Design a binder for this molecule. Sequence first.
Ligand SMILES: [Ca+2]
Ligand SMILES: [Ca+2]
Ligand SMILES: [Ca+2]
Ligand SMILES: [Ca+2]
Ligand SMILES: [Ca+2]
Length: 308
Amino acid sequence: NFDAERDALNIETAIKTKGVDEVTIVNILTNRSNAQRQDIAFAYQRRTKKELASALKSALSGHLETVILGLLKTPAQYDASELKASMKGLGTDEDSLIEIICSRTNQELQEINRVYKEMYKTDLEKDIISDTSGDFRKLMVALAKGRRAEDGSVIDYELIDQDARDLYDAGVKRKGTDVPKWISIMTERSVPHLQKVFDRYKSYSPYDMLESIRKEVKGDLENAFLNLVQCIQNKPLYFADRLYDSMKGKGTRDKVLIRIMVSRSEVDMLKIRSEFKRKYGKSLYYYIQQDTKGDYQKALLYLCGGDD
Ligand SMILES: [Ca+2]
Ligand SMILES: [Ca+2]
Ligand SMILES: [Ca+2]
Ligand SMILES: [Ca+2]
Ligand SMILES: [Ca+2]
């Protein structure tokens, strides 16, 4: 059914329509997979000899432009560009750097590292170093390598118990904190293993892993650990909470809302929606509908994939 040549022609017609037909552009692009959007971009240049991204940047504006241009990038290109943006200047937007590095898998990070180097002619690790310091830097650099252990064929209960005790003895039990121990265990063990470790951890500490972090460390280091533990425990819930935070109260933190809707639309949006509804009462669709307007709202609601 999909025909990149047909979609490209219709988009060209919309772009050249007096006043620009943003609706048609949104109706098409937010209802095509990332791979299909790539096919559409190639078809567009094949037909017009002009680049689709450039054409749309000129035709669109505001938040809608941000969403559409984001959707046109491959997943790795989008993440790489978002990382670059987070470290721009003094890299004050540590929250975004943390969101991406803490939530991406080994496979995703491998491609991100490759693409980042191709796009910016520099190692992602080097820019991360420039935008981080102390143990926060050590944690972020370790995570960005995307070398977390593979899932084992058999559950290692003795190791699970061992890691749980080490996490306790390294933090809540002693004065100060053995941060390197925390970094090693939380970056090197597989996610399923760590989920069990954090559960077993409750047998040694009166505070769960998250509260232990709030009591042991502070600043960006603390936020990085909190974000990482949430992604390990329940990634869809992690994104649901970030989405809620991006819309709660006056205004909207579009940078976060847009990035999550674009980057997770084809990954785990159904689960994100389920967790969102379960925790906040209203559907993600409802929150988006209430926090945004026009074609921008339309685009985000299509990426949401439906109401709950
Ligand atoms: Ca228009
Ligand atoms: Ca523009
Ligand atoms: Ca301590
Ligand atoms: Ca709001
Ligand atoms: Ca808004």
